[PDB]
Amino acid sequence: HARHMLATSLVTGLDHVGIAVADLDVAIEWYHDHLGMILVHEEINDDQGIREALLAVPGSAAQIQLMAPLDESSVIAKFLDKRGPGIQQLACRVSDLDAMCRRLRSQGVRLVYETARRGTANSRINFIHPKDAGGVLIELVEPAPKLAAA
Amino acid sequence: HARHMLATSLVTGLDHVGIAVADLDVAIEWYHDHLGMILVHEEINDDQGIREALLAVPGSAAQIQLMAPLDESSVIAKFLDKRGPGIQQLACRVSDLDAMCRRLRSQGVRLVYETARRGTANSRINFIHPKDAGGVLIELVEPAPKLAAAL
Numbered sequence: 608h609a610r611h612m613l614a615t616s617l618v619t620g621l622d623h624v625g626i627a628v629a630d631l632d633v634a635i636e637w638y639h640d641h642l643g644m645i646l647v648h649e650e651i652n653d654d655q656g657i658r659e660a661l662l663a664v665p666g667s668a669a670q671i672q673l674m675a676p677l678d679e680s681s682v683i684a685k686f687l688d689k690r691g692p693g694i695q696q697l698a699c700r701v702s703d704l705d706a707m708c709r710r711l712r713s714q715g716v717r718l719v720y721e722t723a724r725r726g727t728a729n730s731r732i733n734f735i736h737p738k739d740a741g742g743v744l745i746e747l748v749e750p751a752p753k754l755a756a757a
Numbered sequence: 758h759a760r761h762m763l764a765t766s767l768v769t770g771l772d773h774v775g776i777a778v779a780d781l782d783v784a785i786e787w788y789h790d791h792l793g794m795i796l797v798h799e800e801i802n803d804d805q806g807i808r809e810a811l812l813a814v815p816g817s818a819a820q821i822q823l824m825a826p827l828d829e830s831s832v833i834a835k836f837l838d839k840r841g842p843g844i845q846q847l848a849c850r851v852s853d854l855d856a857m858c859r860r861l862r863s864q865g866v867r868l869v870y871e872t873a874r875r876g877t878a879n880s881r882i883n884f885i886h887p888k889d890a891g892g893v894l895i896e897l898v899e900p901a902p903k904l905a906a907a908l
Contacts (some may be wrong), residue, residue, distance in 0.1 A: 626847070667770035
């Protein structure tokens with residue numbers, strides 16, 4: 608029971624799975640109707656150039672993040688144009704993003720950002736450089752304390 | 758909080774995220790060394806022609822399922838020729854696979870298999886037809902009773 612295993616990293620679980628979709632509105636209803644997922648949150652990431660919908664999966668702490676491009680400069684536009692909709696990122700929840708990123712760089716692994724950016728719900732995020740992880744995009748997510756938002 | 762929300766479907770959670778990799782053993786060490794994931798199971802799926810490694814994420818119930826092709830005939834091999842390594846499947850844990858599948862079919866959603874197959878470690882599995890899910894491969898996973906695997 609991995610919920611009862613002591614960790615060896617600063618990873619505390621899976622934050623979300625990011626899925627690039629064509630039309631976000633139809634996708635939200637489809638995931639809700641057929642899988643019972645619930646639209647918990649919706650927002651624009653201007654930094655990343657995407658429109659996102661956060662779906663809760665009742666019984667589980669990990670979310671499904673549906674993503675659609677805001678414009679063609681989006682990281683999601685590239686993905687969608689080359690292969691259409693698909694699973695585009697795996698996001699690990701982390702307790703100290705700074706600490707893990709320093710540790711990763713000490714281990715020879717590149718990160719995409721010098722400084723964390725803001726993800727969904729004003730979380731702080733970085734990415735392992737995808738070419739260090741063999742084309743897989745791994746995001747590291749530190750949720751912000753609710754006070755920090757205010 | 759979503760862990761304490763009563764579900765409206767037979768999905769009880771996220772079973773795993775499936776990742777196609779080129780070399781299983783080096784990927785295992787990479788995910789363990791850098792993300793702290795722990796190898797809890799390794800097996801060969803002769804039907805789908807893949808070798809698999811299940812990684813626990815301590816503090817979490819969902820797993821990472823690394824997959825490498827055994828035969829060029831496998832779905833993982835085709836995925837790797839076209840796009841290289843990448844995230845290839847999202848797997849929902851379900852409390853009753855057959856009931857879920859009948860509900861999905863009466864809702865107008867197709868399933869890949871007529872009858873469930875065995876997934877990693879005896880679980881019973883099916884897939885929503887990827888064309889029905891806009892190109893995304895969604896697996897439905899029912900863990901099998903431990904007694905089933907012994908018989």
